[PDB]
């Protein structure tokens, strides 16, 4: 009875981590592109304006 309670606690939190990794991988696809876009846009904003060289 004790083992069964302990195992359930472990069985549940395993599912939570696997779901969490899935959540991270799903975002990581789009975040990488967001970071690339932002820098190029920032470089462009300087170009459009007079700021810097």
């Amino acid at each position: 009875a004790q083992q069964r309670t302990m195992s359930e606690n472990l069985r549940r939190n395993l599912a939570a981590l696997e779901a969490k990794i899935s959540e991270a991988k799903t975002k990581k696809n789009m975040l990488q592109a967001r970071a690339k876009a932002a820098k190029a846009n920032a470089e462009l904003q300087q170009t459009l304006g007079g700021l810097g060289t």
Binding site: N9, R12, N13, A16
Partner: protein, 53 residues
């Protein structure tokens, strides 16, 4: 003498921390029942399809 006499008492309070963690996780996201309802709803249609053919 008897590491268990003291150490188990510590384990018995580490257990509380886990129980708190577990309760918070389950409370935050219930998915077993939500998934379960979908399973038994699916089945009734399968009986109708089986009967026809």
């Amino acid at each position: 003498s008897s590491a268990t006499s003291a150490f188990e008492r510590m384990e018995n309070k580490v257990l509380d921390m886990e129980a708190t963690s577990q309760a918070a996780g389950e409370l935050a996201g219930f998915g077993i029942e939500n998934q379960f309802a979908q399973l038994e709803a699916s089945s009734g249609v399968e009986d109708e399809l089986a009967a026809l053919k």
